Symmetry: C2
Subunit: 245 residues, 2 copies
C-alpha cells in the first residue's frame, strides 16, 4: 500500500456499487480533495468490495425488504435508513430512487470497473454504475445492461463485454476483496491513508480533509534548522584546512 | 579600490571637465553599461582629474592656440584634433562649439561636482559642466557661473557657492588627483575595472562592454561541479554512520 512516488501520499478506497453510502462517500471524498492544497500529490487507489459475494444474481424483492432481511431489522427500520440515505444523498447532489433498485450481485460490475480503469476510464465507469444502481433502476448483474453502460462511458462495448464474458478481471476483483478481508475491513466505504490510517464509512468532507492534512504533515514535516556542521560518514578519513571564518 | 558590495564589480573613472574626450567617453561608457546584462551589479566611482592643476584661472586665448602651445604642435595640428573631436562627438549626440571654449582652471568645477555628489546629483552636475565648457562657452572657473550651473541642476545655489568659497572639497579633489598620479594615470578619461584593469582614453563602447564582461566572468565564474563529499575541517573529530545509499 505504498505510493508509486515518494513525494506523494496514498489513499486506498474500498467500495461496493450496491452501497448508497459509497456514492455519498465518493462525493464527500471529492469535496475534501478539492479543498486539499496538496491534492496533486495524492495517489488514489480504488478497490472492489462486495457486501455479499454470494448474493444471487438478482434478488427481485424491494430494497427495503432486502435490507430488513439482511440486517435482521424491521421493515420500518429499513425504511428509516432508506429515507435517511436519500435525504443525505440529496445534499451531495445525488437524487436516489431506492424504490427502483434492483438487488443484483455486483461481481461483474466490479470487473467492468477494472476493465474501464485499464482504459483510463475507471472513475467514469464507477460513477455511471453507481448512478445506474441507485437512481435508474438498472440491473448491474445483467450483461446487456453492463455493456450498454460501458458504451455510454465511451468504452469499446464489444471489447468490454468480451472481457466480462471471459472473466478477465475476476481474479483482480477477488484480490481487492481479499485485501479488505485481511485488513479487517467489514463495511464500506473504507479509506486507508498513508497505508496506516483507517477511516470507516462515508464521513464528512471536513474529516477526510483533516485526515489528508494530518497524514501530509506527518510524512512531510517542516525541515529542521541544522546547527554545527554535518559529520563525515564512515569511509571518510579526510580533512581540509578552512580559511578563518 | 574595492567594491562596497562583494557581489558587485567596481569601475573607477578619472576625468577632467576640460577634456572633450571625457564627454565622449562618458557617452560611450553609458552605452556600454546599457548593454551590460549585470549593469545593476556595477559600482561606478568617479574621480577628479586636472590636465593642468597649475593652469591660470582663465587663459583668454582660442582653444586651438591653447592646444598648439600646450602640446607643442602647429595650429594646423591643433585644428585637426579639434575638428576630429567635434565630428566624433556628434556621433555621441554631442554638439561641440570649441570656438567658444573658455580655457579655465577646473579646480573649482571639480569641487562643485564633489558638492553635488553629496546631494545625490553628481552625474547631473558633471553633465551640466561638460556641456557648459564644451558647447556653451561658459567660464567654469567663474564663481557666478558655477553657482548658476548648480542652480540649474537643482542644487541649493547659496549652499553650493558657500562650499566653493570655503574650499570645502578642495582636499577631496586633490586626493582624487593624487590617486591618479600614483596609478601612473597621465591622461583622461581613464577607466579602472575591478581594481585591476586599466582602459586608457575614450575607447569604443564595444571595448568597454568587453572589459566589463571579462572582469565579470573572472570574478564570477560558473560554479564547479563538486564530486565526492566535502572534507570535514580542522576541529571536527566527528562522524556518523549513514544508511546504505
Amino acid at each position: 500500500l505504498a505510493p508509486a512516488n515518494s513525494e506523494k501520499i496514498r489513499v486506498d478506497i474500498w467500495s461496493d456499487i450496491a452501497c448508497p453510502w459509497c456514492y455519498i462517500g465518493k462525493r464527500r471524498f471529492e469535496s475534501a480533495l478539492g479543498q486539499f492544497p496538496q491534492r496533486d500529490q495524492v495517489e488514489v487507489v480504488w478497490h472492489s468490495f462486495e457486501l455479499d459475494p454470494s448474493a444471487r444474481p438478482l434478488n427481485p424483492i424491494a430494497m427495503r425488504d432486502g435490507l430488513a432481511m439482511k440486517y435482521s431489522i424491521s421493515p420500518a427500520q429499513a425504511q428509516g435508513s432508506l429515507d435517511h440515505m436519500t435525504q443525505t444523498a440529496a445534499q451531495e447532489g445525488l437524487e436516489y430512487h431506492f424504490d427502483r433498485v434492483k438487488l443484483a450481485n455486483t461481481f461483474l460490475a466490479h470487473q467492468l470497473i477494472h476493465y474501464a480503469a485499464e482504459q483510463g476510464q475507471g472513475d467514469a465507469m464507477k460513477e455511471r454504475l453507481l448512478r445506474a444502481y441507485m437512481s435508474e433502476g438498472q440491473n448491474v448483474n445483467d450483461l446487456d445492461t453492463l455493456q450498454k453502460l460501458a458504451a455510454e462511458v465511451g468504452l469499446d462495448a464489444g471489447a468490454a463485454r468480451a472481457a466480462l464474458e471471459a472473466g478477465t478481471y475476476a481474479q483482480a476483483v477477488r484480490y481487492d476483496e481479499a485485501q479488505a478481508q485481511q485488513l479487517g475491513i467489514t463495511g464500506v466505504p473504507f479509506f486507508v491513508l498513508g497505508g496506516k490510517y483507517g477511516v470507516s464509512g462515508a464521513q464528512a468532507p471536513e474529516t477526510l480533509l483533516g485526515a489528508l492534512s494530518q497524514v501530509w504533515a506527518e510524512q512531510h514535516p517542516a525541515p529542521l534548522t541544522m546547527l554545527g556542521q554535518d559529520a563525515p560518514a564512515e569511509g571518510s578519513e579526510d580533512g581540509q584546512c578552512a580559511v578563518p571564518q
